[PDB]
Amino acid sequence: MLTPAFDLSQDPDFLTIAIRVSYARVSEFDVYFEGSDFKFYAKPYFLRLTLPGRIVENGSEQGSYDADKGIFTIRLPKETPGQHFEGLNMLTALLA
Incomplete structure (x- = not known):
């Protein structure tokens, strides 16, 4: 297996992931965002990212997935x- 070169970018009014x-x-993917927990679910691939802040939930957001270029980008609104x-792309993951 190979670790995807994912990247994270956030704006003063949203937080986008790539x-x-x-x-x-998997014909379809699964994205779970709550408070500050971003979890991706697609085939053996499991992505667990803990946001430094908090992203609101309202079904609005904004993003899109492209197979042609092979890149999934989803923007999310902020709670504040x-x-x-x-330090989004600087942060680190902790093992539990």
Whole structure:
């Protein structure tokens, strides 16, 4: 298996995520975002990311998945204005 070169980017009014995959052995993917927990579910691929801040939930958001370029990008709203998730692509994951 190979670790996807995913990348995270956040704006003062939203937080977008990017996951690159082509092996997608699932006709559809699953995205779970609550408070500050972003979990992706697609085939053996399991993505668990803990946001530094908090992203609101309202079914609005904004994103799109493309098979042609093999990149899934999904933007999400913030729970507080002016909130910026620092060290996003610098942060680290903890094992439990």
